[PDB]
Design an enzyme around this catalytic site. Structure first.
Site, PDB file in Angstrom:
ATOM      1  N   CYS A  54      -2.513   4.836   1.660  1.00 45.30           N
ATOM      2  CA  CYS A  54      -2.393   3.335   2.093  1.00 45.30           C
ATOM      3  C   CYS A  54      -1.092   3.431   2.960  1.00 45.30           C
ATOM      4  O   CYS A  54      -1.240   2.064   3.872  1.00 45.30           O
ATOM      5  CB  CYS A  54      -2.077   2.880   0.615  1.00 45.30           C
ATOM      6  SG  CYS A  54      -0.557   3.562   0.039  1.00 45.30           S
ATOM      7  N   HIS A 140       2.446   1.588  -3.627  1.00 47.77           N
ATOM      8  CA  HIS A 140       1.427   1.069  -2.911  1.00 47.77           C
ATOM      9  C   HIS A 140       2.069   0.406  -1.578  1.00 47.77           C
ATOM     10  O   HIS A 140       3.053  -0.340  -1.919  1.00 47.77           O
ATOM     11  CB  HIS A 140       0.496   0.292  -3.677  1.00 47.77           C
ATOM     12  CG  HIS A 140      -0.498  -0.497  -2.738  1.00 47.77           C
ATOM     13  ND1 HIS A 140      -1.555   0.600  -2.430  1.00 47.77           N
ATOM     14  CD2 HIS A 140      -0.981  -1.573  -2.116  1.00 47.77           C
ATOM     15  CE1 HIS A 140      -2.515  -0.070  -1.842  1.00 47.77           C
ATOM     16  NE2 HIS A 140      -2.130  -1.431  -1.515  1.00 47.77           N
TER      17      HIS A 140
END
Length: 145
Positions: A54, A140
């Site tokens: 990510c 994230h």
């Protein structure tokens, strides 16, 4: 502060263990580029892209640089032990990888974390990007504010 054995044993690197900002001087925001590393000397082994990618996708969105090129750039400046290890495979890349990318691609990032905005990357740059980070777990990274 203590010396990590995988790093000192890493045959992709040479020389002594030093803070990233000592081996790769730039105008980093204070206490972001102090993490220990070694000079990367061996050419790229072409590590597979990380499963938890990510951070690459977020930086790619903001720079228009492919994740493949970002990842090969990380292999130019960091020892393999700092790119593929238990932490990167279970938690993903970190803001220390972001600092390394910020040097390699001359940007400064504002990371919008759950604790507020934080600058990563050299100030002696033109390019600016915005990255969002949530702690979760899991960690994230996403592009934009």
């Amino acid at each position: 502060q203590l010396l990590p054995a995988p790093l000192t044993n890493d045959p992709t690197a040479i020389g002594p263990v030093l803070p990233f900002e000592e081996l790769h001087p730039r105008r980093y925001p204070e206490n972001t580029a102090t993490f220990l590393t070694r000079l990367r000397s061996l050419p790229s082994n072409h590590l597979p892209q990380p499963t938890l990618n990510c951070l690459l996708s977020a930086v790619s969105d903001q720079t228009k640089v492919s994740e493949e090129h970002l990842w090969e750039s990380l292999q130019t400046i960091l020892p393999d032990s700092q790119l593929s290890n238990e932490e990167t495979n279970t938690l993903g890349l970190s803001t220390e990888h972001l600092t390394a990318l910020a040097h390699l691609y001359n940007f400064q990032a504002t990371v919008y974390s759950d604790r507020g905005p934080i600058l990563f990357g050299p100030s002696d740059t033109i390019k600016r990007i915005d990255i969002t980070h949530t702690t979760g777990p899991p960690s994230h990274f996403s592009p934009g504010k």
